[PDB]
Design a protein around this ligand. Structure first.
Ligand SMILES: *CC(=O)CC[C@H](N)C(=O)O
Ligand SMILES: [Cl-]
Length: 509
């Protein structure tokens, strides 16, 4: 789903009905645009991918009980039903996000956002109390960007590409920035439709309704929490599929997912999707897992020429120029295209978050202590929204698919992060050893995969021809912010700057 909203606009009917369409790709099933009674220079645009409640879930969500609340969100509130039941709320729709309205009316914004077990970016307008609220989930899984002017014009969107062509009177340049994960903002609505920020607030989770850490207890809890993470993510009336690369993380996801689909008596085969250059070791690993779990497996072969040819639109989708991110996004974009083209799988499970959470990257083998390693894991998790989780969202949403990432489950990730730092560093000499031991009695995946530790070259050779030595020598002059250090870096930056000239500070690093 793609959200777009303006408060305090000059003209949000004629010229900005057209700006709401820039993020259509995220939500192919339906579009609604509307303005606000009494505040007709404030408006919403919503592109829906209908995942829960096809008939009654169109947004802005507006229900009879709360005539002055307007909610637009991209997300999934996995614990909505148990809150609904505990508090005995009566829904008008059947959509998970309606819980946000009932909780807000009861307790305000802070006490609402801390209760949501899920992923989300939202905008909530309350015309009785004269407030606008922005919010984003803890790890930043679902995206949000914002722009605000001194006169009190506010514009928000799922992707920066829906903000950069807005023209506000008396601002020659509209500054666009990511909205920070794990924050809410409160803004005052003024009588003429402009807004003024009150506070931007970091929130933590609340309730919705050495001593210990023995290894058998830790492994048992991790199994249960991971299973729960996947189970709560079966919430959808659409077909669930799964990316399956043959790596440990996607394999554990695929295998646990199929087991949970069976327990729920789901009647469709699980479709799994791998992509690579043919005769890859990774593709054979993926096929091995597929046969072990019994999925309906699609193996997609990408061509060097196809990959290079996709860079332009991939960087357009991503809105960043980080080398690691751009490299990996080409394959994810192309597999997502294939999924949308060839199947009806819409809710796509993936393994992002695991490496950051479990200290799985090779360089963690060189960490000065368990506390310096633990700290680095915390920085990686805080920055996911710029990197791996940016890639995972932008490249699936580019083709009208919905990403789900169970490693970033709130209860599972919190429990793992609570573990003594010394149970989490590699003691045997293999990364993610605890994670592997957790699942070794399950027969969940083949033991060979459970214990396993030139697209890159083709990109080098291509950018070598596109960036000459003088361009590189001149790089600090042409690109003074986050200057590129390689020709690969330089090339991605040029593509980025052609789409988003002057926007390089979306990436801090
Ligand atoms: C596209 C999206 O965020 C889904 C919103 C809600 N869960 C739904 O309509 O399925
Ligand atoms: Cl998720």
């Amino acid at each position: 789903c793609g959200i777009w909203a303006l408060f305090g606009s000059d003209d949000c009917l004629s010229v900005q009905c057209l700006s709401a369409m820039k993020i259509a790709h995220r939500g192919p099933d339906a579009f609604r645009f509307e303005n606000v009674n009494g505040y007709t220079n404030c408006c919403f645009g919503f592109h829906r991918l209908a995942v829960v409640d096809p008939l009654f879930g169109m947004q802005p969500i507006r229900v009879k009980k709360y005539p002055y609340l307007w909610l637009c969100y991209n997300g999934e509130i996995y614990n909505h039903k148990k809150m609904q039941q505990h508090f005995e709320f009566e829904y008008q729709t059947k959509v998970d996000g309606e819980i946000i309205l009932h909780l807000y009316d009861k307790g305000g914004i802070e006490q609402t956002i801390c209760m949501l077990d899920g992923v989300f970016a939202f905008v909530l307008l309350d015309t009785a109390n004269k407030k606008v609220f922005l919010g984003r989930d803890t790890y930043g899984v679902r995206p949000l960007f914002k722009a605000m002017t001194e006169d009190g014009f506010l514009a928000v969107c799922s992707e920066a590409k829906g903000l950069v062509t807005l023209k506000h009177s008396a601002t020659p340049f509209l500054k666009v920035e990511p909205f920070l994960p794990g924050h809410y903002e409160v803004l005052d609505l003024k009588p003429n439709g402009k807004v003024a920020s009150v506070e931007m607030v970091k929130y933590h989770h609340c309730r919705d309704v050495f001593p210990g850490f023995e290894i058998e207890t830790v492994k048992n809890n991790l199994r249960i929490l991971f299973n729960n993470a996947v189970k709560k993510r079966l919430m959808t009336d659409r077909r669930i599929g799964c990316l399956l690369s043959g790596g440990l993380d996607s394999s554990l996801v695929a295998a646990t997912l199929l087991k949970q689909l069976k327990e729920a008596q789901v009647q469709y085969p699980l479709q799994t999707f791998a992509i690579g250059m043919e005769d890859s070791p990774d593709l054979l690993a993926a096929r091995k897992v597929a046969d072990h779990i019994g999925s309906e497996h699609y193996e997609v072969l990408f061509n060097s020429e196809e990959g290079i040819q996709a860079l332009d639109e991939v960087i357009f989708s991503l809105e960043t120029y980080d080398i690691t991110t751009v490299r990996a996004s080409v394959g994810m974009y192309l597999i997502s295209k294939y999924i949308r083209k060839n199947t009806d799988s819409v809710v796509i499970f993936s393994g992002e978050g695991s490496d950051e959470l479990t200290q799985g990257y090779i360089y963690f083998h060189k960490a000065p202590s368990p506390e310096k390693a633990e700290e680095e894991s915390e920085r990686l998790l805080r920055e996911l929204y710029l990197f791996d989780v940016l890639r995972a969202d932008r490249t699936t949403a580019a083709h009208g698919l919905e990403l789900r990432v169970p490693f970033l489950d709130h209860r599972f990730s919190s429990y793992y992060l609570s573990l003594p730092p010394e149970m989490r560093i590699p003691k045997n000499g293999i990364e993610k050893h605890l994670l592997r031991e957790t699942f070794e009695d399950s027969n969940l995946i083949p033991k060979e995969i459970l214990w396993r530790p030139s697209w890159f070259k083709i990109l080098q050779e291509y950018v070598e021809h596109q960036v000459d030595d003088a361009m590189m020598a001149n790089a600090a002059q042409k690109f003074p912010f986050n200057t590129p250090k390689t020709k690969e870096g330089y090339y991605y930056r040029q593509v980025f700057e052609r789409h988003y000239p002057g926007r390089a500070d979306w990436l801090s690093h």
